Amino acid sequence: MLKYIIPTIMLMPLTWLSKNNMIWVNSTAHSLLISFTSLLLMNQFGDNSLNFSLLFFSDSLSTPLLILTMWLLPLMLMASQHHLSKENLTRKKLFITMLISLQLFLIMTFTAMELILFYILFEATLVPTLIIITRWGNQTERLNAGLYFLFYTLAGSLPLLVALIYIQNTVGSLNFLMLQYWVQPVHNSWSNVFMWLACMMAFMVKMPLYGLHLWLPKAHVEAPIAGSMVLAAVLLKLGGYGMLRITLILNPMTDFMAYPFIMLSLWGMIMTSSICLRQTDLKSLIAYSSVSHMALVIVAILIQTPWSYMGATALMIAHGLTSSMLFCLANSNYERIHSRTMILARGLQTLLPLMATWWLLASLTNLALPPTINLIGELFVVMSTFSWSNITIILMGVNMVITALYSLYMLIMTQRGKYTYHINNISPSFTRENALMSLHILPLLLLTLNPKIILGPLY
Amino acid sequence: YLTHQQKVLRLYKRALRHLESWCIHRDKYRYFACLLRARFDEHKNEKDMVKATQLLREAEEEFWHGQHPQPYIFPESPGGTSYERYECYKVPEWCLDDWHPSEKAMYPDYFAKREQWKKLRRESWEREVKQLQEETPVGGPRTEALPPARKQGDLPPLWWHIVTRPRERPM
Amino acid sequence: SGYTPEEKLRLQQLRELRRRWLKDQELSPREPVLPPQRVSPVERFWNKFLQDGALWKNVIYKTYRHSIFAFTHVLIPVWIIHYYLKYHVTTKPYTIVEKKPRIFPGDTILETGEVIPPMKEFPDQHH
Amino acid sequence: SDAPPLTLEGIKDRVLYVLKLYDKIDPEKLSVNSHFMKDLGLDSLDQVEIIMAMEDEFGFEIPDIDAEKLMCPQEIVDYIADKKDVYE
Amino acid sequence: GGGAHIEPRYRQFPQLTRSQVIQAEFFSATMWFWILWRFWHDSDAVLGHFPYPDPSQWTDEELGIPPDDE
């Protein structure tokens, strides 16, 4: 992994020591090269994972999340340089440093071989994430929403620490490979029930689960484009990746301790998909789409079947590329009309022909048009939850019907109709904006030709 | 509002069209149309405004149960087949300011004339601003009408969009 | 009553403007000015050869285009599909599975020269 | 749509053509500026029926509010030109 | 693009072409030719192919219903 950590570290000396005008060209061109060498992580074997050292390994579940992570950094530089053109150079370089710092923690987070090393790097990510979202965030609106952290830390990160520490004193190790061969059944007990919640609540909030989701729409409204791209694409997946790993040592308690959460997710899919219909802000509509999609991932993880785990891994990767593409498309308008209201600008397909095409592809993959990996993931989750209980096809079916409605309602409102007469600043799309969309949807469509790489370690 | 004079007249046109839909054939429509005219002229001489209103009350109520469930609608009118059909082809004129200079070379003469028209708007605006100010009754205009030009070579206030609106069938 | 004197004036003033603007929308005889665009002799050949045309002359030109279509858009695609099916798809088990042919009474087998037994004699219905 | 071109002169002929066939009105009295209420002396009701006829000549509705403001043939002709953007 | 070889007519029956009418006759008449030949050569399909027997007219000899006493 050092082959990736080190060159990612060397991006900070690169940014600081570059010509003042060539920071974006260097950082984007060299953050792109790092991603190219990240295709070496697909040296996967059928029986055994790819273990590099005592600290870091890479199995089929982390390989895509690592390649997605390093693919996103060059995209987040292209997305952000336009609205950072005003501000001075030293403040400009720090913004790039925070993004390079975030990648470095994320590549170590997905590959950490020990759970405390994962936990520490799992919380260290929030440090760059919060600086980006609050210092460069477009919103100074004053939320007082730190109570969502006070709720998170008190109810999430702290119990995860006490449980992980408790487990090591008992099992003797937190090496993931060791837990595969040393895990023991979790007997029913009021003490074990608290261990189960401690090991999962931290990840449920980040997904986020229904009921704990209200932080996500607020965070997306504040964050700059870079904050939302990393937040929707990856940081939501840290909870998903965390639950896939940690459910190994929670059996068989997951059989009966997962009923309350599945009922939140299954019913959560319908509630948030319906709320999308009535949304007035793009970023909130896209933010509520994420909660509706991640609700499948939570159900897939908790029913723990070989098909569901393949489904969750495809959804996590597919959702990441799609949602970040939608966030960028929403930002392209905001960089014009300078508002996040959906109704403000309409009929934009009359003035921006090619951009309307990108909107169409992004919407199609969000509503899950076969054979996109957006449906390969969703179909597998639907197949397995059917076995879990045939009734779930009712809730799964309705969520497909609503999902097509806000997917296309978003398309119809912003791209169809009569253009708003008074808006006269819809300049033609830049090559930066078209290249940025093409780098979300060309990889996303090409993955359909070889879908095995994203189907996880259960493949 | 519209006063009892207009309100009744509208009913005439609306009632006629529905009849025209019901009878379908022209001949039956014409004959049944004349009968309708008779009912209108019968009480046209009623000089009691209080009574005149009551005729309308029942008149409209009669219409409500005469209306054809599907009344014929002109294709290019609201509710018609072709309504808003071409709004996709109508591109607002200001989009031409963003054309690449190489493109604009393809249409030199038209763009040359466009510069003339743009210059007219810019210079006239300051004069046009004044005209509304002076005529405006302090406290906000009470009606949406506008005043025509009161000097030679002065264009009526707010003329750009009405003049340069997209054609009916641009393509 | 119709339009007040001002309304009649305003509509008149604008109307003249609208009609001039629409008049300006017309294109000049030279427009649109274009770069020449290249012409390969393949273009040149038919440009003058078919200038006179006539049925017997241009039937060659119509058959020419279809020939260019047929070779590029039918013959070449079927070589690729045949090379692909014969030397890649049929060289793997069960890729192309075909329903076994219908064997009727009194038929001859190519493989074995076998002759299927004839059917029993029908009850000799009136037919 | 083949070619249904419209020009002011042609529109003017058609509007008058329809006007002449209205029995209540006389052919020779009629002229482009013949106020319906006065020069031809017709009820306001009859003014409605003239409008409804014109809609069918060109097959496009004239809104109720704007129909009232039309009171002479020359008004109608220019209204058509406006809606159908007849410039020459 | 024949320069609108058909010219519009006002309040009058349109201009038609001879060729347009000929082909219309050829196919519309051809429909009747086909319909007629099919009745003639294959009338059975419309009117049946075999005689539907009457169940009641059959004898208990063929239906083998033994005598009431038997």
Partner: peptide, 17 residues
């Protein structure tokens, strides 16, 4: 197609970019 001249400038957004 059926008439001469009458070619009107067609207003479209920039297709160059």
């Amino acid at each position: 197609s059926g008439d001469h001249g009458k070619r009107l400038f067609i207003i479209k957004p920039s297709g160059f970019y």
